[PDB]
Amino acid sequence: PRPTVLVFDSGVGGLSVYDEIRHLLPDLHYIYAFDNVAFPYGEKSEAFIVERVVAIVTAVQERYPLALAVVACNTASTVSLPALREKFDFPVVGVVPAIKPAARLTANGIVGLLATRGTVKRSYTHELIARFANECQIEMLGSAEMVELAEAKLHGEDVSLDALKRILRPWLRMKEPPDTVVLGCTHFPLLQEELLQVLPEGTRLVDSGAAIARRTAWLLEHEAPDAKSADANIAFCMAMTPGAEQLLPVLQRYGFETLEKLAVLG
Numbered sequence: 001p002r003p004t005v006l007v008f009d010s011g012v013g014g015l016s017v018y019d020e021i022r023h024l025l026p027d028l029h030y031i032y033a034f035d036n037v038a039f040p041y042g043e044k045s046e047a048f049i050v051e052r053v054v055a056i057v058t059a060v061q062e063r064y065p066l067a068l069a070v071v072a073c074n075t076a077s078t079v080s081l082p083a084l085r086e087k088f089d090f091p092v093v094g095v096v097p098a099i100k101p102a103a104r105l106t107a108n109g110i111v112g113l114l115a116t117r118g119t120v121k122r123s124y125t126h127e128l129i130a131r132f133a134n135e136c137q138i139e140m141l142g143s144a145e146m147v148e149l150a151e152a153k154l155h156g157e158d159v160s161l162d163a164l165k166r167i168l169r170p171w172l173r174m175k176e177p178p179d180t181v182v183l184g185c186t187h188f189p190l191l192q193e194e195l196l197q198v199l200p201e202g203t204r205l206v207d208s209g210a211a212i213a214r215r216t217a218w219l220l221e222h223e224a225p226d227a228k229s230a231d232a233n234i235a236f237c238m239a240m241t242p243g244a245e246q247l248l249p250v251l252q253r254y255g256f257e258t259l260e261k262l263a264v265l266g
């Protein structure tokens with residue numbers, strides 16, 4: 001039996017964070033849960049999102065006591081953390097765009113932020129940009145379409161590079177584009193290869209994955225309750241739809257043998 005860790009996202013983006021966590025802590029009892037019923041969260045009202053994520057974690061907790069939970073979703077983290085930390089007695093990890101380290105890595109002072117449409121309109125974002133990136137200029141680019149490209153990719157469809165170039169056209173037309181790009185959407189690291197083929201040579205991609213993994217390992221050491229299981233890793237969807245089912249092969253490649261429907265009360 002090993003500590004049970006939940007990794008949550010509205011869709012497949014959570015898998016990029018999970019991938020980093022499992023690389024650091026490979027023997028844990030992982031539970032991956034994705035809200036295919038309410039995806040995408042980017043458009044949704046914040047009041048709905050908070051209630052929804054709290055309800056999903058509540059349902060997961062009923063199936064398995066949790067040692068720790070990761071909200072590997074930018075559009076949910078910020079607004080949901082206080083509520084989740086109040087209701088549960090296990091540490092909760094959140095995610096915010098890696099602007100801070102990107103600001104210390106840029107050489108030309110131009111830092112780009114790729115996030116979903118809803119994330120670039122949040123006050124939480126605008127604030128972080130001023131708090132740890134006062135010495136550099138931030139180029140924001142929100143794209144709900146890129147999220148879909150990531151979803152498509154893990155569903156078996158090939159990513160159209162032309163679609164990406166179009167989305168990134170603004171940056172490709174810059175005299176001096178960002179030399180550092182923050183992936184502020186957990187779906188984006190999944191498109192790393194494609195992004196590197198389209199973005200100008202020398203662009204460095206930065207995300208929160210490895211840092212989340214380290215934070216997870218620290219919490220499992222200094223805060224997580226003794227909640228463990230010997231059961232194999234499992235993936236939960238909120239509705240057994242063709243779309244969710246189509247993720248089975250990828251989920252299996254990621255280490256989740258089974259995909260089951262989770263009953264949620266919210």
Ligand SMILES: CC(=O)N[C@H]1[C@@H](OP(=O)(O)OP(=O)(O)OC[C@H]2O[C@@H](n3ccc(=O)[nH]c3=O)[C@H](O)[C@@H]2O)O[C@H](CO)[C@@H](O)[C@@H]1O[C@H](C)C(=O)N[C@@H](C)C(=O)O
Pocket residue numbers: 081093094095096097098099100101207208211212215
């Ligand atoms: C060990 C620690 O306290 N880390 C905090 C610190 O990040 P810093 O860049 O200095 O170091 P790092 O831990 O290597 O993190 C790198 C980057 O990864 C991301 N990161 C890291 C840890 C985490 O739990 N969540 C997260 O989103 C951040 O964008 C951070 O900017 O400063 C960041 C900016 O304030 C914090 O988001 C980050 O997480 C802490 C644990 C935190 O409070 N995170 C938020 C999400 C929360 O729990 O409410």
Ligand SMILES: N[C@@H](CCC(=O)O)C(=O)O
Pocket residue numbers: 009010011012013014039040041042043072073074075076116147184185186187
């Ligand atoms: N994984 C995405 C979720 C995108 C969405 O649901 O709109 C994020 O980090 O917010």
